[PDB]
Design a protein around this ligand. Structure first.
Ligand SMILES: O=C(O)[C@@H]1O[C@@H](O[C@H]2[C@H](O)[C@@H](NS(=O)(=O)O)[C@@H](O)O[C@@H]2COS(=O)(=O)O)[C@H](OS(=O)(=O)O)[C@@H](O)[C@@H]1O[C@H]1O[C@H](COS(=O)(=O)O)[C@@H](O[C@@H]2O[C@@H](C(=O)O)[C@@H](O[C@H]3O[C@H](COS(=O)(=O)O)[C@@H](O)[C@H](O)[C@H]3NS(=O)(=O)O)[C@H](O)[C@H]2OS(=O)(=O)O)[C@H](O)[C@H]1NS(=O)(=O)O
Lengths: 189, 189, 189, 189, 189, 189
């Protein structure tokens, strides 16, 4: 019983100002979990979408700027796809862009420019070995939609060039999911 | 955002015994409401299936017998489709089968025989005028999936021939519904 | 060195009687392990089928009734396929059929009727995450035929409607397996 | 329930030196029994390979030398197929080669050379009359896989020229058999 | 960013002499890890090949002899492919060749003969369950190239026939690997 | 063993303000060396990319502005390709644009506009004679990837029109290189 749908979530991210003169970059990570998109249900149905299995097909991360088009001290960054839960260490002012030479690098124009990334994440099945599957719609694993313990999906790391002014963003993540085995429970009343 | 699915519900019906010698029939009615198939949800989602609109396409009423194949004093009844909320009055021992000459009559062999009826019900929009639409999949009205006040659908009346022994049935109603406008709400936690 | 064969096993299951008047259902689970079908061998060959690897292709669960065709208080249940080791909790008299709205539900006529289910099970590789593969004969994983510690395969849950009389069944499970790498050891004597 | 496969075994054979000056040969036969290749099983299953029947298709005898290539006093011998269990008498130093003129003769270089024979053996049904069937894959008989009383098959005899030095070989046998009637037995535990 | 290359490594293996008269075999195992082929890098690049992911496609194990062609007491052994990290126990003088009846057995002529094996290994993801994938170039898992903790690949076990003389070998393992996601880091200087 | 890849590097360039009223231009040069893109390696591998030879195919110089789009006193400059290590002399306020009549001149809109140049540089083999090859992918010379003494490539000179305000730029040079003869060294540990 397949049901392809779309789930979204919005949150903020700010790159604080720095008095440093050099071009330094601010590094951070981004994971994706389905608990943040799918709330708990009620009653005999533990989740709000009554299905048993799921598998995330795609994610769309949108960096919607919060800064005016008149803001100066512009910069240039990079967003890369990291499917293994080993990101570059979080840094406030690093002397280089680590994600620049990555094959999945897209340039981030800053601060007042929109940046989208559309990709297929991978689940963290074993963080010790960090193995994942290649892209195959027919062979992608089905995970279970747990009650409160779903596994973290992974796949984006960023590097933003710091500035004299604060750079704020409203980040909207949209997960395109595919469920299976409609499992609604209908007790009497 | 269409989603065709199937919702079921099971309940009992008994035709009590009678010392009456004549062939008399027991008349009863059967309505269909979506509250009995779709429970209330939890949180910002008032219902368990997160959709706004619905329209019932078909219903399958199944009279599953509870009586052995050795039971005697067998009989013959009738099930008809009544799309207007004006049934023959409920009777315990009526001297005739009212639903026998109906164009939608199917014979009910009793007591140990299975009886199915598959039809398209109609909603009770105005009980004073009792108007309904003909069968058209493209023009069928969309109703709203209310929180606790959905409208009764209608479409089956029965007449069972009484017997010296009690005739029990387990009635399984299956509604084939079609929803629209996925409206999940995802607050933070 | 492929060898497709067929292994069987027979055991009993009883749904005890209940004085409860309502229609209640008895829920239970069913796992499959190869130790119950393949005994230990003798000598340098730890198992009786001299192969290294295996993978279960299909299972046929047959509910052979033990009850006469004259038994009354008949009922209606459901059997569903559960490939993840999270079954509905075992219950004696539950007020509803949980497996009724499952996409893999087959109706169980009770008590004197035969019920078969033919499906492809999945192994329990990680019970915490509960991941499994879709059906693909060419890509199905090969497991090792361990000596005394093989992994449990999963895939059936049932719901039987209770009755005044005891409902007994003789359940015959047949696993269609596929072995690899003939590994017979022939020491002197 | 057919199952073609391959079984093997290894043992040693030596040809002690002789002070005789004339060209003399040493004679010896070779039988083939399955009990040497197939150990006993365990439990209800008397044999490790669970089938009832078998019938040998082919045998591959391999004379692997143990000697160096620098060894002198080279010689020459013969092998032949004998399907009756009435061989030439075993001899140490015979003045001629009995197996030379047989139609199934293949020459044997000595001492450091590889030699192989690939043929269809035959069983010993009646040692008095010593009869068998011509080669036919469809009309070959099916024998029973006994517990500790399988029959001896036959089909090779040899003749090796003696020397001043000891000639040692490692003999590997390989059987190509074909079983039938999978007969596994699964008692409880 | 795919880069198929070839990595090699050379080491020794000796089968010590034995006064035992019988034909006995020496059993040993062989695993493959990428730390032994890929050294640690320097600086911000933890490894010498600047890539993130890898997957081993093939391995070529070459037994290059160290013994002269005049060496006697020759023998015959077996090499088999064991993709699950459960080898036959290491033995000095075992009374039989365990790997002889394996479907992946290749004969090892000893002592002065070259033996190659070319196969696709499998990683040890769970040693408790010992599951692996079949051969599929498109679906083979990508592992992470860890810094100092890579997972052991597996796939060869041997059985060498003992001798009066020591049998030495220089074993050259060549792994054909496939990397992904070039991740060079270029800080200033 | 060819491996085409891409190496990047980012640095700053500022055109300081001038009180001069006339239109004057600021002249500067730009060379390219592989030491600034490829760091030193570690151990027996002197460089981080384990190859022997290289040849630079293309370079992409990107002038990413640092100035707001509201900045006035705009100007117009020129970027030319100079493949011989004899640039126009560096000047702070020159009374004309020297690179304007060059056949390889591209106009630089200033200050808030992006300027890219994509070309094939040439190495400085003899600065006395200053000879170089025409563009030919098949005949381009292979240089050696030295340890700390690589030769400077050349090919861009600029002329920026001065302004009352400071004009800052973040210059990102990307070299598209082609290596040869994978030369990894793997000592023991
Ligand atoms: O010994 C000979 O007579 C002679 O042997 C060979 O010549 C060599 C000399 O023997 C050797 N000296 S020795 O020390 O005596 O060995 C040296 O002198 O060199 C010579 C030159 O030959 S060589 O260069 O080849 O060595 C030669 O035979 S051969 O070498 O095998 O070719 C022959 O010249 C001759 O042997 C033949 O005759 C004997 C004696 O019988 S007779 O000739 O008929 O009188 C044959 O013996 C047969 O087989 C045995 C047996 O298999 O045991 C007997 O069979 C019966 O018993 C079995 C059961 O066994 S038991 O439980 O009784 O032990 C029953 O199941 C059978 O049914 C019985 N036979 S039946 O009912 O009559 O059919 C019996 O003695 C005899 O039976 S029969 O003849 O088969 O019927 C011998 O096989 C035969 N040689 S063969 O080539 O045919 O094998």
């Amino acid at each position: 019983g397949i049901f392809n749908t779309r789930l979204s979530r919005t949150f903020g991210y700010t790159i604080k100002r720095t008095t440093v003169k050099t071009p330094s970059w601010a590094v951070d990570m981004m994971r994706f979990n389905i608990n943040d998109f799918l709330p708990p249900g009620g009653g005999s149905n533990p989740r709000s979408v009554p299905f048993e299995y799921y598998r995330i097909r795609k994610v769309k991360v949108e960096f919607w700027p919060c800064s005016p088009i008149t803001q100066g001290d512009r910069g240039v960054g990079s967003s890369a796809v990291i499917l293994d839960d080993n990101f570059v260490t979080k840094a406030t002012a690093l002397t280089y862009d680590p994600y620049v030479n990555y094959s999945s690098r897209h340039t981030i124009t800053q601060p007042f420019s929109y940046h989208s990334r559309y990709f297929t994440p991978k689940p963290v099945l074993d963080s010790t070995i960090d193995y994942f599957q290649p892209n195959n719609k027919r062979n992608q694993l089905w995970l279970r939609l747990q009650t409160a313990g779903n596994v973290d999906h992974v796949g984006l790391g960023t590097a933003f060039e710091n500035s004299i002014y604060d750079q704020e963003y409203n980040i909207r993540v949209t997960m395109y999911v595919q469920f299976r085995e409609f499992n609604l429970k209908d007790p009497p009343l």
